[PDB]
Symmetry: C3
Subunit: 154 residues, 3 copies
Amino acid sequence: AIEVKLANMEAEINTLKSKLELTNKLHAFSMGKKSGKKFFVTNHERMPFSKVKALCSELRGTVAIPRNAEENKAIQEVAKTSAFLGITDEVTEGQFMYVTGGRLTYSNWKKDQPDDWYGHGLGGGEDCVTIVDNGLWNDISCQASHTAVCEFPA
Amino acid sequence: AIEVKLANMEAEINTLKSKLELTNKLHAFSMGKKSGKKFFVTNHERMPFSKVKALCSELRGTVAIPRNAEENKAIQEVAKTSAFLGITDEVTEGQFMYVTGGRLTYSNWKKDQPDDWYGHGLGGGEDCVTIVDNGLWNDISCQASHTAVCEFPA
Amino acid sequence: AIEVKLANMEAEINTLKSKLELTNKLHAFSMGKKSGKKFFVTNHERMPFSKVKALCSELRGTVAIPRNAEENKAIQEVAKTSAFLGITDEVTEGQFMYVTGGRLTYSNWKKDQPDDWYGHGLGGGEDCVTIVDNGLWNDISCQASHTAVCEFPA
Ligand SMILES: [Ca+2]
Ligand SMILES: [Ca+2]
Ligand SMILES: [Ca+2]
Ligand SMILES: [Ca+2]
Ligand SMILES: [Ca+2]
Ligand SMILES: [Ca+2]
Ligand SMILES: [Ca+2]
Ligand SMILES: [Ca+2]
Ligand SMILES: [Cl-]
Ligand SMILES: [Cl-]
């Protein structure tokens, strides 16, 4: 009994691991993940930047980051409306960095952006960035509520 | 050593349980579940009430129930058409009841509703309720087939 | 106490098996699987036939196969564009077989199809099959890239 039972349970566990792996692969496929390509997902909820970061982290992902023109379109395609990107200049004004560290390698800044505008009325300038429906970027208040779009690896 | 092996397997199972909880959260998210809000989902197949209860209960859910405005809205936006609500007046006509227990509070009936049209010839009167595209409710025979839309806790 | 821990472990694994089954049922439902019907899913990615086969097999599914008009409509609605079907005449030219075995029965060929056309330039004739926007079929090169649509049992 004992050792045989324990050995069986090891196989039961290993089997459940593979089944859950498959379940994850099937769910990623159903949500449009393309082979060897990172994928973006949203629940279409609007919330402040801090909450987006917290939510994506809780899903073991990150706030969507467009690294090139293709991903930028992929993100605008998933969001539909304005969405926060994992890029901010909170650490040093004027210097945008990825939430995952490092300076920008790609940008699609809209005409007259970024400007750290104060007139929004939420207080402070603008330290966060949103991708709008046309794919263009705009620095906005991290306090404002925009669509949460999480990114998961390729 | 048996005990060590056993402890290592307990740790594995705990990892699997966490991974499954994550799988569930990411799925809810991908299907639009909003933070702190009920989760409404549908496959679009229409069937009699008893079947919907059996189906949602198989998924550890309940037939949708719009307890307030936003919820009634969410349901009507996920249903796309006439879908059963978890409400019935089989204990006392006119006295609708949440299948989960409790007297009907919020409501969005249609004019001339409920009429309890006992005359369809398929099974008594109209003891069930369906929400339609316009969000309004109508009392319908529980024998009739309508869209299955389940709800899951916030 | 070894035996108590082993018995709790058995119960833990079963609870996990039960939870994963529910997760799979919920996912299929959210993906549009009707009761007692097989369901079709796509990530909307285009690739050669061998790739689609490999991908669906990895998910424990098979390349979509219409066995009647309803299923043909279901697949057509899911794909939204040209997609490979699990039907080919690669074993014996002119005779179409299902990838899971057996001679093709139900068909929905477009007028003048199949024609084993070589004029595409991809080399060889046309041994695979795509369902197009209107639901009609066309034999095509297995080397061409079409939408990956997988089928999972009822
Ligand atoms: Ca076993
Ligand atoms: Ca700034
Ligand atoms: Ca700005
Ligand atoms: Ca009644
Ligand atoms: Ca009525
Ligand atoms: Ca326990
Ligand atoms: Ca051929
Ligand atoms: Ca052809
Ligand atoms: Cl800010
Ligand atoms: Cl071919």
